Amino acid sequence: SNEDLPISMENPYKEPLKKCILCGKH
Amino acid sequence: AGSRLETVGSIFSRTRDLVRAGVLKEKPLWFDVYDAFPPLREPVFQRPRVRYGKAKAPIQDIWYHEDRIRAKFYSVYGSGQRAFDLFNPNFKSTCQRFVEKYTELQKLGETDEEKLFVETGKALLAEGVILRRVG
Amino acid sequence: PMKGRFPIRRTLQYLSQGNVVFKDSVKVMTVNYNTHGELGEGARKFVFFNIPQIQYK
Amino acid sequence: EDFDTRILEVRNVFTMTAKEGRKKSIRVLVAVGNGKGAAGFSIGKATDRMDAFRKAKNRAVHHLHYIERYEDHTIFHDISLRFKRTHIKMKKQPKGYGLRCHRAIITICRLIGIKDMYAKVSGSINMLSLTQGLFRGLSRQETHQQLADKKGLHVVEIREECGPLPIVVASPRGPLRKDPEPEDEVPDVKLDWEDVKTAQGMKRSVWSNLKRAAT
Amino acid sequence: NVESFASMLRHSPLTQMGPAKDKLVIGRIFHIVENDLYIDFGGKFHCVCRRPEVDGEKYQKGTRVRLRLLDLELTSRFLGATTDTTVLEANAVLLGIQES
Amino acid sequence: EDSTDFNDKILNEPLKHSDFFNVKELFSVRSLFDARVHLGHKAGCRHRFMEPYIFGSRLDHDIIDLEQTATHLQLALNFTAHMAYRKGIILFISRNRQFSYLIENMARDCGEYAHTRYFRGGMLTNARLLFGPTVRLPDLIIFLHTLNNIFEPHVAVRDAAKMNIPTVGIVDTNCNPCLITYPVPGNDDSPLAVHLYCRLFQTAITRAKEKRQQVEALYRLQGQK
Ligand code: FES
Ligand SMILES: [Mg+2]
């Protein structure tokens, strides 16, 4: 159809979720 | 004796009907123009409702294939120290210059992503572009 | 309003619209049907819509 | 001059004031109409009754509804609606049936120009909710031309007096569909137990179908 | 061969900019009230920046300046609100003047 | 005898043409795009009745579909031009104080009327009391901003409908267009968008008034001879 139309996808600029200072530590 | 029931129909329907009933002796100055060139939607009052349960708005997020290249470029090299000029309709930023070279090399048959990204930076450095990695 | 879906089924006019009047030989009619499955859909509607008309006649 | 005004309710309302104590005012409901589909209603408030009459009737002509009439004598189809707690069920009727409706509905129907209709009011019988519900129901009815245009099919009227003759009452102005309307073997429409109880001869009321003066 | 809206939007600098947070843009002072500078930078809403203490007199109507964008429109939904409250202005930090 | 010919050659002839005033030459999707007309508010401010006119959301910022704006703007300008041709009273209304001065000047220059100030209760629905029994109300109300300064619909939108006055209105993504006769989805905030709208309506109105004089003058010269 048309090449310049928007395409469906997930936010590429989405920032990673923030983590607590103890995330992943026992 | 125009009706003031603005929530019952539209000014056109209320005016047309009262003209038929003989309540309005003369048609208003705008009626003939509306009839010849009506709006796309008839202006009828509607009450806005909040959505509930699983109802969602049909508005989609606007994304482009190059947005993936822009997200990586900003992560690797950050925002360029050059300032955006959003007044110039043909402005090209360092990111856009990177995207255009990245697109050109992809059309040359290269398909790897991590390799297609490193070769693009070298091409710009050869052209004199300043690419200071953030980290 | 009348309770239930398709309240038309609970009217004398609807029940008298059955066209199946069994011969005197017929004494018992058993209906074996399945609650789910696309191939048993007609039998479910038969139980839902027409068994009342058959029994009425 | 073409409009007639009718009173529907005159009420003495009272508010309490600091100095004067129990204060008396008049609340009036009036309906206006020209007998040709244009009709409206308005509330009037004043300390004196004649001032309430003036305010109500003069205001109502600025809030007129247009009501479509089938053959200029009845409604286009049965109307069943609820306005707040007042239920109004109206039935389209043939000529000569007269207005067999709540006395207030009779008054309003004469202002609109409806000659033949049955109506039953159930639930709260409040004059203002009855009047406001009545005008809502009558304003929101689909005409035969609107039905034909919406579905792109002919609207064919069958009369037992005229036998099997098909009478086209409305045809779509735009293109005419070629696909017949689907014939659902059994309609999933909600029925009123009162209508079903009556059609089955089970509704036994000493007050129904009583002889009354021409309305 | 008339350009479509979808094409204009794809190739617009505002679209190509991506997220606005921490993006350097060039603005223009169009209105001044005391020491409050109203600066347009190509977006829907202007930003309001206080006159810098150093070289304050250099900032005049028409002066082009460098900004670091934070938000194109300041909006937030507060307790009990059905829609977001908007102040109808962008959030940006005035860095200095742009010179050639 | 002569009136039927007058109304037929002057009042009914323009109504037989799709664009009698050639208002499509006044704007283009590119001209609207350069004026930032496509820029809407953030998604959190979106009004439900504006979803049909929204192209999408670009990073939580709604984009107005200029393909629709172009068609809606064509109708609004065409209607506005025809009402000016018929010598209708056109009233511009907006509470956006950034553009009050601009809008008041645009009205005076085109020979029309502007109301950009606080709107007092009953200017339209109680005009005879406020102005006099013979006061003539506007035949067309053009809203360059449909919201008041507390982000609610301007009271004149409802009151214009009550008085059966057609309304042209720029409707942003946070506006309610249900009662606006000829709504035009477009950015109402950016000075470039607002200035464009004023140029377009000013030009449409000025052209239509000049056309009315041309047609009348020709109709008279031919009448004598
Ligand atoms: S954020 Fe706390 S465990 Fe991951
Ligand atoms: Mg806006």
Q: Looking at chain B from residue 86 to 105, which residues have their Cβ under 8 Å from any Cβ of chain A?
A: none
Q: Which of B92, B80, B85 is nearest to B131 (CA)?
A: B80
Quote the CA–CA distance of D26 and D202 in Å, as a whole number.
45
- How many separate domains does chain F show? 1
Q: Where are the beta strands (DSSP E) in D84-182?
A: 86-92, 99-100, 117-123, 155-157, 167-170
Cross-chain CB nearest to C8 (options D186, D193, D200): D186
Kindly calculate the radius of gyration of chain A based on its CA atoms and give it in whole angstroms.
18
What 3-state DSSP class applies to D20?
coil
Measured between CA atoms, the residue of chain A closest to residue E19 is: A13
For residues F83 and F110, give the distance between their C-alpha atoms in angstroms, rounded to a whole number: 13
- A4 → closest Cβ in E4, E18, E19: E4
Indicate which of B33, B35, B86 best probes the interface with F, i.e. most F CBs within 10 Å of its own CB.
B33
Which of the ligands is closest to the CA of residue A19?
1
Dist. CA F30–CA F37, nearest whole Å: 10
Query: Looking at CA atoms only, how far is residue F125 from chain E in angstroms?
Result: 30
The answer to whether F27 and F78 are in contact (CB under 8 A) is no
Residues 6+ apart with CB under 8 A from F24: F74
Q: How far apart are CA D126 and CA D124, in angstroms?
A: 6
Ion ligand 2 neighbours, Cβ < 5 Å: F 172, 188-189
Within 13 Å and on the Cβ side, how many CA atoms surround D163?
Answer: 1
The closest alpha carbon to F39, from B91, E44, E7, belongs to: E44
Residues ≥6 apart with Cβ < 8 Å to B10: B42, B43, B44, F181
Structure tokens at F147: 């919201």
CA distance D106 to D102: 6
A6 touches chain B (CB under 8 A): yes
Cα-based distances in Å from C33 to B15, C1, C45, C53: 60, 30, 10, 18
**Is there an atom of ligand 1 within 6 Å of A23 CB?**
yes
E74 vs B: CB within 8 A: no
Q: Is the backbone of residue D96 left (phi > 0), alpha (psi -120 to 50) or beta?
A: left
What are the two backbone dihedrals, phi and then psi, of residue E39, each rounded to the nearest 5 degrees?
A: -125, 125
- For E2-90, list the strands marked E by DSSP: 23-33, 36-40, 47-50, 64-71, 75-76, 85-86
Residue E89 phi/psi, 5-degree rounding, is: -155, 150
D200 contacts C12? CB cut-off 8 A: yes
Rounded distance between C-alpha atoms, residue B111 and residue C5, angstroms: 59
Alpha-carbon distance E90 to nearest alpha carbon in chain F (angstroms)? 11
Report the distance separating Cα F145 and Cα F41, nearest Å.
Answer: 14
- Residue where the block lists tokens 């629709």: F68
Ligand 1 contacts CB of residue A17 (under 6 A): no
The residues near F56 (Cβ < 8 Å, ≥ 6 apart) are A6, B59, B60, B61, B62, F62, F63
Pairwise CB contact (< 8 Å): B59 & F182: no
Evaluate whether E16 touches B93 at the Cβ level (below 8 Å): yes
- Cβ of A4 within 8 Å of Cβ of E19? The answer is no
Distance A26 CA to ligand 1 centre (A): 11
Of the candidates C7, C12, C49, the beta carbon closest to that of D191 is on C7
Contacts of A13 in chain B (CB under 8 A): 67, 70-71, 74
Residue to substitute from D78, D186, D200, D203, interface C, most C β-carbons within 10 A: D186
Q: Are E56 and E35 in contact, with CB atoms under 8 Å apart?
A: yes
Residues D153, D171 contacting (CB under 8 angstroms): no
Instruction: Please list every residue in chain F whose beta carbon sits closer than 8 Å to the beta carbon of residue B11.
Output: 161, 164-166, 181
Is the CB of A13 less than 8 angstroms away from the CB of E7? Answer: no
Domain assignment of residue F218, given as a range: 3-222
